[PDB]
C-alpha cells in the first residue's frame, strides 16, 4: 500500500518548491502598480500575473524531470499552461466567505467586480469562481495541491510540444504518486483522484475562454501597452 | 520689432499644449510602481519615462504643422528625440538647492544616487546634472521653454526622417518665433538665443550616451522585462 523512497522524494521536492515560490503574506504585492476602483484594474492585475509567472517558472525548474527536457518543450509547456497553473495556486488565497481572493486589506481583496475592471466579461468569471468553489470544497492537502499543479504543467496535450512521449512518462509517474498518496494519507478520499482529474478538464475550458478575451485585448494597443513584457511573451502567439 | 498674428498663435498653441500635458503637482506619480531605495529604482523610473512619453506624444500632436506630416516621420522624430524632450521638461521639476528632481516628498525626490539604482553610470549622470544647472540658470520663460522643446522635436537631423525638407521648414519657422520673442519680451536676452541653440547640441551628447547604456540593458532580458511596452518601442531599434 505505502509509497516508495523515490515517490516520497518527489513529494519532498514539490512541497519545498511551492514554499519557495509562494508567499502566504503577499508582501510583494505593494511593489505592483496600485489597484484602482476604462480598465482601471488592468495595471495592477497585469503585474499580479507577471509576478505569478515568475514564480511558476521557479516552481517548474524544481519539478523532478522538467529540467532535463529541451528548452523548447519547457517553453511550450509553460506558455500553454501558465494561466491554468496560476488559477490553481490562486485558490490558496480564495475564500468561500466573501467569494473573492483575499491577499490583504480592502486593496488586495479582488472581488468579481474588480476583475471586470480589467476587460473580462462574466463568460469567464462565472465558471472561474465556480471552479474555485469546487476546488476549495475538496480540501486538498498541501501535497495533493502541489501535485495537481505539477500534473497540470506536465500535460502532453499542449500545442507546441515535440517530445510528448517523455512528457506523458513524467505526468503518469506524477499521477501514480498522487493516486497512491490519496489511498494512504487521505481518509475519505476514495473518489478524490477522479475529482482532481476532472478539475484539469475544467481548466482547459477556462484556458480557452481566457485566451479569447486576451486575444481581443492584445489587438488594441492602448490596452496591451499596460501589460508587462513577460505577460506579452507568455500569452503571445510567437513561436 | 513686434510679432505677427500667426506667430503669436503658435505661442498660444504651444503653451496651452504644455499645460494640457504637464502636471505641476505630479499626482499621477502614485500610479507608478513604487520607488525602492540590483536595479531597485528601475521599475519606478521605467513607469516615469513611459508616462512622460505619452505626454510628449500629446504635446507633439498639438504642435502646428506636426500633424500634417506623414505617420512615419512622426515616429522617426519622436523616437530619436524622446529622451531629449523628456530631459527638457524634467528641468521644470529640477531644483538647484538639492541638485535633484523634486516631484513629491522623500519618495519622488530623485537624487543622483537614485538614478544609479537604475543601471546608469556617472558617464551620463555627470553631464546630465550639468545640463540641468545650465538650463535652470537661463531662467527661460514659459514661452521660451515650450519653444525649445518644439524646436528640439522638429529637428531634421534625426535618423529615419524622409521628408526632411518640410521638417526644416517647420523648425526654422519655429526658430524665428523664438528668436523674435527674446528680442521683444525678454530683457537682458541679447545672447539668449545662442545659449538655447547650444543646449540642443548638448542634448545630442546626452542622447548618445543614454542610448549606449540603454542598449547594454536591452540585451539582458532579466532587466529589460522590468521596462514597459511603450519604452521598449520608442527606445527600440525596430523600423
Amino acid at each position: 500500500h505505502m509509497l516508495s523512497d523515490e515517490q516520497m522524494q518527489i513529494i519532498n521536492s514539490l512541497v519545498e518548491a511551492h514554499h519557495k515560490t509562494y508567499d502566504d503574506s503577499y508582501s510583494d504585492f505593494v511593489r505592483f502598480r496600485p489597484p484602482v476602483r476604462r480598465l482601471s484594474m488592468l495595471p495592477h492585475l497585469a503585474d499580479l500575473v507577471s509576478y505569478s509567472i515568475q514564480k511558476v517558472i521557479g516552481f517548474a525548474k524544481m519539478i523532478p524531470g522538467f529540467r532535463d527536457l529541451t528548452a523548447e518543450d519547457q517553453i511550450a509547456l509553460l506558455k500553454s499552461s501558465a494561466i491554468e497553473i496560476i488559477m490553481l495556486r490562486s485558490n490558496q488565497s480564495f475564500s468561500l466567505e466573501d467569494m473573492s481572493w483575499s491577499c490583504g486589506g480592502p486593496d488586495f481583496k479582488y472581488c468579481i467586480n474588480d476583475v471586470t475592471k480589467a476587460g473580462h466579461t462574466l463568460e469567464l468569471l462565472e465558471p472561474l469562481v465556480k471552479f474555485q468553489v469546487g476546488l476549495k470544497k475538496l480540501k486538498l492537502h498541501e501535497e495533493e495541491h502541489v501535485l495537481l499543479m505539477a500534473i497540470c504543467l506536465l500535460s502532453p496535450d499542449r500545442p507546441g510540444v515535440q517530445d510528448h512521449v517523455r512528457i506523458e512518462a513524467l505526468q503518469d509517474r506524477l499521477c501514480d504518486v498522487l493516486q497512491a498518496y490519496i489511498r494512504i494519507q487521505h481518509p475519505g478520499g476514495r473518489l478524490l483522484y477522479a475529482k482532481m482529474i476532472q478539475k484539469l478538464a475544467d481548466l482547459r475550458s477556462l484556458n480557452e475562454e481566457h485566451s479569447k478575451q486576451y486575444r481581443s485585448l492584445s489587438f488594441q494597443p492602448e490596452h496591451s501597452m499596460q501589460l508587462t513584457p513577460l505577460v506579452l511573451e507568455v500569452f503571445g502567439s510567437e513561436v | 520689432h513686434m510679432l505677427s498674428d500667426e506667430q503669436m498663435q503658435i505661442i498660444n498653441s504651444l503653451v496651452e499644449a504644455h499645460h494640457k500635458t504637464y502636471d505641476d503637482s505630479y499626482s499621477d506619480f502614485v500610479r507608478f510602481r513604487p520607488p525602492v531605495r540590483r536595479l531597485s529604482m528601475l521599475p519606478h523610473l521605467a513607469d516615469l519615462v513611459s508616462y512622460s512619453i505619452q505626454k510628449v506624444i500629446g504635446f507633439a500632436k498639438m504642435i502646428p504643422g506636426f500633424r500634417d506630416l506623414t505617420a512615419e516621420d512622426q515616429i522617426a522624430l519622436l523616437k530619436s528625440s524622446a529622451i531629449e524632450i523628456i530631459m527638457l521638461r524634467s528641468n521644470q521639476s529640477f531644483s538647484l538647492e538639492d541638485m535633484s528632481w523634486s516631484c513629491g516628498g522623500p519618495d519622488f525626490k530623485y537624487c543622483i544616487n537614485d538614478v544609479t539604482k537604475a543601471g546608469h553610470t556617472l558617464e551620463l549622470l555627470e553631464p546630465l546634472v550639468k545640463f540641468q544647472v545650465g538650463l535652470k540658470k537661463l531662467k527661460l520663460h514659459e514661452e521660451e521653454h515650450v519653444l525649445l522643446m518644439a524646436i528640439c522635436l522638429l529637428s531634421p537631423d534625426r535618423p529615419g526622417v524622409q521628408d526632411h525638407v518640410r521638417i526644416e521648414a517647420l523648425q526654422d519657422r519655429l526658430c524665428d518665433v523664438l528668436q523674435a520673442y527674446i528680442r521683444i519680451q525678454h530683457p537682458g536676452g541679447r545672447l539668449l538665443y545662442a545659449k538655447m541653440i547650444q543646449k540642443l547640441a548638448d542634448l545630442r551628447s546626452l542622447n548618445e550616451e543614454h542610448s549606449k547604456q540603454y542598449r547594454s540593458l536591452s540585451f539582458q532580458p532579466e532587466h529589460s522585462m522590468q521596462l514597459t511596452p511603450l519604452v521598449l518601442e520608442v527606445f527600440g531599434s525596430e523600423v
Binding site: 515568475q54 511573451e233 | 539582458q220 522585462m225
Partner: peptide, 10 residues
C-alpha cells in the same frame, strides 16, 4: 523569440 523565458529558465 521568447528571450525572457530562455533567461528565466536560467
Amino acid at each position: 523569440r521568447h528571450k525572457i523565458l530562455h533567461r528565466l529558465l536560467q
